[PDB]
Design a protein around this ligand. Structure first.
Ligand SMILES: CCCCCCCCCCCCCCCCCC(=O)OC[C@H](COP(=O)([O-])OCC[N+](C)(C)C)OC(=O)CCCCCCCCCCCCCCCCC
Ligand SMILES: CCCCCCCCCCCCCCCCCC(=O)OC[C@H](COP(=O)(O)OCCN)OC(=O)CCCCCCCCCCCCCCCCC
Ligand SMILES: CCCCCCCCCCCCCCCCCC(=O)OC[C@H](COP(=O)(O)OCCN)OC(=O)CCCCCCCCCCCCCCCCC
Ligand SMILES: CCCCCCCCCCCCCCCCCC(=O)OC[C@H](COP(=O)(O)OCCN)OC(=O)CCCCCCCCCCCCCCCCC
Ligand SMILES: CCCCCCCCCCCCCCCCCC(=O)OC[C@H](COP(=O)(O)OCCN)OC(=O)CCCCCCCCCCCCCCCCC
Ligand SMILES: CCCCCCCCCCCCO[C@@H]1O[C@H](CO)[C@@H](O[C@H]2O[C@H](CO)[C@@H](O)[C@H](O)[C@H]2O)[C@H](O)[C@H]1O
Ligand SMILES: CCCCCCCCCCCCO[C@@H]1O[C@H](CO)[C@@H](O[C@H]2O[C@H](CO)[C@@H](O)[C@H](O)[C@H]2O)[C@H](O)[C@H]1O
Ligand SMILES: N=C(N)NC(=N)NCCc1ccc(I)c(Cl)c1
Ligand code: SF4
Ligand code: SF4
Ligand code: SF4
Lengths: 176, 71, 307, 154, 100, 77, 145, 44
């Protein structure tokens, strides 16, 4: 099914011709345009008062990465490297060895935040909810190097943001 | 005929003008060529999906749909 | 005493220009469902000061002729301030018997700053942009002069304060609204304002910059003050002249604000299209209305006094 | 002496950070979130950050998207024509360090190979709010400058 | 004297603003034919010729005070009509076109 | 590894907002595509700018590029 | 007249912010003199307000503390100053504030939130977290060629 | 019981989409009559 956007015949009677003459000479449609912008002048603006007010986000938001712990404090990551394998940007670099107590743990866990496309595949792939994209988006830096996260930075992010990260996972894990 | 070397992304237009009239338009593109098609050959089918968001990056989910239907 | 009077005109003009940039940004913002400057000082009241200081300590970034590179902004700003000295508000700084002709003569010189800066640009493409701007400006000078003459056939003289007397009973916009319409549009095109802002349009398809900007925005205010006097005459009470100044300021502010309103409302003309608007539309009507306004006072026996 | 130099520095810093006019290099998708920062919700103009400034009237270059090898010379040329003081904001993974296209034959691995960068905004793309946070971070960097104090001590 | 003072003040101030605009502390220690288009020339010339006719019409507000109104009105209209004829000729000879 | 895709080639297209957007996707039987040609509608549209702009003025070139709806992410890929 | 009720609404904001000085303080610190309901306050001094008659996005806001972690933040406020437990509420990731739904406590969670430390001596510096891979032979310390 | 995002029982209310540019103003005749009337009063 189709419709014509612009296939109409102007009425050529004197009244219609004189109507178009009045529009040409008295700029009626241009004045009608002035009314629209005038009505917007008197509308409340849509602006929010950042940083005192923030745009709404959802629990699914993909922000800065973090490495999480179990309630006991043990790391969740067991160096399976599924995140590293799935990473579309190859932003993740992992090395692992047996820990001094025999645990399977990483000795290197780096995310190049300037390679990362913030896609969330890593946190989908992870079988133990170890790597997550947290809610933080306000972490711009003055140098390139500060955006090359090693494991200490990522564990610190997890300890810094775990209160919010856990609550967001609680809200969304039934959709996963 | 004056030649204008410059006249969504970034485009380089090389134009031939005869007064006000355009006599030739020669778009020079590739200023945003990033070898996506070659990169996709080093990705699994899932890893390649986010590349389609970044093509017509105003119509992200439609690009995703086209690739998903093909796969 | 007179030098104090000159400064009580020059200084407020520059301050009014500074805060028109804030008003323009905020009026445009609210018509765009946003706020415009509201952080740099309460309600953005310090924004013009920050912009002014910023521009003047910016690197002043070769000219094809040093003399003309410096002449062009001096001419622009000097001429712009000069257009104010005969304006009756209600008393002029200088009471000229031919004040209307003086403003016409001085405004016709303003196109030299465009021409000289194009010559000094040292770039073939900037000179061409300047010549296109000049052709637009002189084209709309034609209708402005003829419209002004038509109105003065009801006033009787070239004295600006006589327009006040002519409109003692009634604004001239009522007998001359067709001329008021073309006059208003002509001022927009004359000041390269949207939808006639083709220099800034076509172009994209520090202190010296600030100086040209001040000259243009002073001209915008002045043109709307001239429009208020020409068509919306305020009544003058000689024992309470401040009453005239308040009413006449409000009209000029509203006319200036309607320049911003129009910028927010329409797309841009093509160059050839704004030339046709003048040569094929405004000029034919202006010529016919000039004949009409020559005949009308004679045929109604409403010829104004010479003095 | 010290008091005058300090107060004058505060004045020029306040003027420069309160009137930041950006030249935006809208290279790719990050340019869309920059448009959203100008849009009504965030209204960058309300901070004194005009929507679009000419390169010769600009104080900050925002590199919003992938910088290809073919484009790199042009970007440097615009940077060199900027009047000082001039700052560069790198927006998004592509400009930060190549991002999704880091390993491409045609892509510069970070705009900081071409121009010095003052602020790096992460994200692919950073949200309009994230970019605004970055612009305000640049404002704070400008507030820390002590050009006149260092000049006085030369 | 007043007008001379005003003009000297306006342009003297404009000179000074240009001066400081070009020289402030910086704190650092380290004739052919321009792709000639005939159409833009004819706009300028057409403006000139119409400007000379406007020069002839400017006296009209004073001329209306004459007792010889029959002659004065006829000549005023004659001048404006001839201006219209000039525009009509340019229009019909494609002098107001920007194509080609 | 990802899922293996049976070998073959398909041209698949949709009505995207900018026009026909398709991929010629070639599988070799493995979990990685062998070839992925992206057909972007703006590519052919921009190739037609010179044809469409004939007999128009400079300022109309802006309008024509706009009417074509051009994003260089998909034109350049 | 309506313009009358608007004007008294403006005056109430002066007394709603504890007089002229408090009113001017919020005007210059935050460019906003609205009066909302106090939802709570965090250990750093940030105060959180709500007004559900405002349109979505303006119905929640924070007045940042004037001092955090030894930094004078009277003028220099930052979005990264919001601690994570209030971050969820302020961004409308949830409906209920931490004063009503407190976060789960863990011994490893930071007791003291830190804002963005870029450009300071506390900034993060990357380094390799793995040990040396190849051990070089060390020659003997006695002469014996 | 299964609980997922669904439309309300009975569906949502009608959604407008058709162009709606309401007709306003006077006819060309009336507009010209007002303009000529203003001029005649001004001339008088
Ligand atoms: C010509 C003289 C012009 C004097 C301009 C004075 C500017 C006043 C001012 O600094 O604004 C208050 C500003 C306000 O501080 P602010 O710029 O940090 O703003 C903080 C509030 N928010 C978060 C909303 C941005 O005070 C200062 O910034 C301190 C520096 C003083 C600069 C003036 C030195 C003289
Ligand atoms: C009894 C005896 C009586 C004798 C006297 C009779 C005379 C009165 C009757 C005649 C009325 C004359 C009206 C004169 C106004 C000028 C009309 C005009 O020129 O409009 C035509 C012009 C071009 O129209 P267009 O559609 O593009 O094409 C036509 C040609 N092809 O279209 C335009 O000009 C459009 C203008 C473009 C600019 C847009 C921005 C302006 C919009 C806001 C304007 C607000 C109104 C201004 C008010 C000023 C107040 C001081
Ligand atoms: C561009 C630079 C600006 C140039 C300015 C041009 C000056 C033109 C002024 C003419 C205006 C005028 O006619 O009045 C000024 C005055 C005569 O006053 P007026 O009211 O007209 O008649 C006498 C009293 N009824 O006449 C005078 O005051 C005499 C002034 C003579 C000196 C002017 C020299 C100008 C030279 C510029 C180069
Ligand atoms: C269609 C939209 C086009 C947009 C174009 C922009 C139009 C802006 C026009 C602004 C002027 C509107 C008038 C503002 C009135 C300001 C207050 C005032 O002056 O009131 C006095 C006036 C009657 O007094 P008065 O002006 O002295 O008239 C006597 C004749 N001399 O009282 C009469 O009101
Ligand atoms: C209120 C009205 C009520 C209705 C009843 C009224 C009856 C009484 C009025 C009778 C007057 C009728 C005169 C109409 C003649 C118009 C002739 C014409 O249509 O010319 C148009 C044409 C130019 O059009 P163009 O764009 O070049 O080509 C079309 C391609 N699209 O051809 C041309 O080249 C244009 C003509 C040459 C230019 C002459 C310009 C006129 C002179 C300017 C001054 C105006 C007259 C004196 C003042
Ligand atoms: C309206 C009245 C305003 C009164 C304000 C008075 C303040 C006087 C102190 C001004 C200090 C300006 O500070 C300085 O400005 C110049 C403007 O080019 C900048 O630029 C300068 O330094 C850079 C290198 O740093 C040079 O490459 C450049 O050629 C030079 O112009 C400096 O980077 C900035 O440090
Ligand atoms: C291409 C060339 C075009 C040339 C166009 C010339 C058009 C001229 C048209 C009108 C010319 C005469 O216009 C008008 O006619 C009437 C005729 O009663 C004259 O007569 C009227 O005024 C005179 C005063 O002088 C009175 O004495 C008389 O009682 C009165 O009727 C007017 O004085 C004259 O102003
Ligand atoms: N076009 C706008 N209204 N905004 C804008 N950025 N204007 C230009 C800013 C400006 C220029 C000169 C001076 I002196 C001042 Cl005070 C401000
Ligand atoms: S979000 Fe995507 S690109 Fe970033 S580290 Fe995770 S998988 Fe890699
Ligand atoms: S973060 Fe998860 S997916 Fe990645 S290596 Fe650790 S356990 Fe495996
Ligand atoms: S960083 Fe992401 S959003 Fe920005 S240009 Fe690159 S791919 Fe597009």
């Amino acid at each position: 099914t189709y419709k014509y956007v612009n296939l109409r015949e102007p009425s050529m009677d004197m009244k219609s011709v004189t109507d178009r003459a009045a529009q040409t000479l008295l700029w009626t449609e241009l004045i009608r345009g002035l009314g629209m912008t005038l009505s917007y002048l008197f509308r409340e603006p849509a602006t929010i008062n950042y940083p005192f007010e923030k745009g709404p986000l959802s629990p699914r938001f993909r922000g800065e990465h973090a490495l999480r712990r179990y309630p006991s404090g043990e790391e969740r990551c067991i160096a399976c490297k599924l995140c590293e394998a799935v990473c579309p940007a190859q932003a993740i670099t992992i090395e692992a060895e047996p820990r001094a107590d025999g645990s399977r743990r990483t000795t290197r866990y780096d995310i190049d935040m300037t390679k990362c496309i913030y896609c969330g595949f890593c946190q989908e792939a992870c079988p133990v909810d170890a790597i997550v994209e947290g809610p933080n988006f306000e972490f711009s830096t003055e140098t390139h190097e500060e955006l090359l996260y090693n494991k200490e930075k990522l564990l610190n992010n997890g300890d810094k943001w775990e209160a919010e990260i856990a609550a967001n996972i609680q809200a969304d894990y039934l959709y996963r | 005929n004056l030649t204008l070397n410059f006249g969504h992304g970034v485009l380089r237009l090389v134009m031939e003008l005869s007064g006000e009239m355009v006599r030739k338009c020669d778009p020079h593109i590739g200023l945003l060529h990033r070898g996506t098609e070659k990169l996709i050959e080093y990705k699994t089918y899932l890893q390649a999906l986010p590349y389609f968001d970044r093509l017509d990056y105003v119509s992200m989910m439609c690009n995703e749909q086209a690739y998903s239907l093909a796969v | 005493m007179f030098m104090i009077n000159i400064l009580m005109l020059i200084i407020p003009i520059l301050l009014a220009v500074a805060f028109l940039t804030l008003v323009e940004r905020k009026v445009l913002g609210y018509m765009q469902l946003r706020k415009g400057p509201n952080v740099v000082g309460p309600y953005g009241l310090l924004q013009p000061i920050a912009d002014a200081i910023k521009l003047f300590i910016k690197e002043p970034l070769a000219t094809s002729s040093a003399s003309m590179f410096i002449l062009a902004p001096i001419m622009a700003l000097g001429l712009a301030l000069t257009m104010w000295i005969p304006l009756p508000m209600p008393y002029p700084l200088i009471n000229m018997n031919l004040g209307v002709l003086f403003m016409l003569a001085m405004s016709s010189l303003a196109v030299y700053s465009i021409l000289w800066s194009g010559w000094a640009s040292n770039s073939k493409y900037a000179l061409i942009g300047a010549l296109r701007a000049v052709a637009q400006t002189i084209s709309y000078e034609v209708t402005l002069a003829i419209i002004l003459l038509s109105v003065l056939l009801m006033s009787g003289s070239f004295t600006l304060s006589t327009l006040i007397t002519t409109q003692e009973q009634m604004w001239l916009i009522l007998p001359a609204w067709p001329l008021a319409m073309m006059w208003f549009i002509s001022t927009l095109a004359e000041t390269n304002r949207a939808p006639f802002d083709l220099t800034e349009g076509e172009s994209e398809l520090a202190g010296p910059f600030a100086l040209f900007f001040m000259a243009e925005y002073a001209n915008i205010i002045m043109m709307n003050i001239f429009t208020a006097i020409l068509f919306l005459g305020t009544s003058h009470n000689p024992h309470m002249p401040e009453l005239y100044t308040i009413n006449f300021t409000i009209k000029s502010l509203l006319l200036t604000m309607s320049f911003l309103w129009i910028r927010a409302s329409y797309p841009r003309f093509r160059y050839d299209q704004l030339m046709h608007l003048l040569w094929k539309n405004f000029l034919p009507l202006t010529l016919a209305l000039c004949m009409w306004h020559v005949s009308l006072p004679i045929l109604t026996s409403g010829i104004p006094p010479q003095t | 002496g010290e008091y005058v130099v300090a107060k004058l520095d505060d004045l020029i810093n306040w003027a420069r950070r309160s009137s930041l006019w950006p030249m935006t290099f809208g290279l790719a998708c990050c340019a869309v979130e920059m448009m959203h920062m100008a849009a009504p919700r965030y209204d960058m103009d309300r901070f004194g950050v005009v929507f679009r400034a000419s390169p010769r009237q600009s104080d900050v270059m925002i590199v919003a998207g992938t910088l290809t090898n073919k484009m790199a010379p042009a970007l440097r040329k615009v940077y060199d024509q900027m009047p000082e003081p001039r700052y560069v904001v790198s927006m998004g993974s592509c400009a930060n360090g190549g991002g999704y296209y880091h390993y491409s034959y045609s892509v510069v691995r970070g705009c900081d190979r071409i121009v010095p960068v003052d602020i790096y905004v992460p994200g692919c793309p950073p949200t309009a709010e994230a970019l605004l946070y970055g612009i305000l971070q640049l404002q704070k960097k400008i507030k820390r400058e002590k050009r006149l104090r260092i000049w006085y001590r030369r | 004297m007043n007008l001379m003072l005003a003009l000297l003040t306006n342009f003297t101030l404009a000179t000074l603003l240009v001066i400081i605009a070009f020289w402030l502390p910086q704190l650092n220690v380290y004739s052919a034919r321009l792709p000639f288009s005939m159409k833009f020339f004819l706009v300028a010339i057409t403006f000139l010729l119409f400007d000379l006719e406007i020069a002839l019409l400017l006296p009209l507000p004073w001329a209306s005070q004459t007792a010889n109104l029959n002659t004065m009105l006829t000549m005023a209209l004659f001048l404006i009509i001839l201006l219209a004829v000039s525009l009509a000729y340019e229009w019909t000879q494609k002098g107001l076109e920007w194509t080609e | 590894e990802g899922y293996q895709v049976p070998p073959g080639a398909t041209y698949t297209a949709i009505e995207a907002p900018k026009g026909e957007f398709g991929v010629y996707l070639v599988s070799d039987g493995s979990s990685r595509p062998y070839r992925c040609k992206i057909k972007a509608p703006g590519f052919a549209h921009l190739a037609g700018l010179d044809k469409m702009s004939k007999g128009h003025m400079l300022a109309d070139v802006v309008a024509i590029i706009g009417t074509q709806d051009i994003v260089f992410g998909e034109v350049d890929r | 007249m309506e313009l009358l009720q608007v004007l008294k609404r403006g005056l109430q904001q002066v007394s709603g912010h504890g007089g002229l000085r408090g009113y001017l303080r919020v005007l210059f610190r935050a460019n906003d003199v609205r009066v909302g309901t106090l939802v709570g306050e965090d250990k750093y001094g940030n105060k959180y307000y709500e007004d559900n008659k405002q349109f979505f996005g303006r119905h929640r806001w924070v007045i940042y503390t004037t001092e955090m972690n030894g930094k004078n933040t009277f003028w220099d406020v930052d979005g990264s100053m919001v601690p994570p437990e209030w971050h969820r509420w302020l961004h409308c990731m949830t409906d209920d504030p931490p004063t009503v739904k407190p976060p789960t406590a863990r011994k490893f969670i930071w007791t003291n939130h830190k804002f963005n430390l870029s450009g300071t001596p506390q900034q993060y510096v990357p380094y390799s977290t793995t040990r040396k891979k190849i051990q070089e032979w060390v020659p003997p310390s006695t002469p014996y060629k | 019981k299964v609980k997922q995002d669904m439309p309300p029982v009975g569906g949502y209310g009608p959604i407008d989409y058709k162009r709606n540019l309401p007709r306003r103003g006077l006819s060309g005749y009336s507009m010209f009559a007002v303009g000529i009337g203003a001029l005649l009063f001004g001339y008088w």
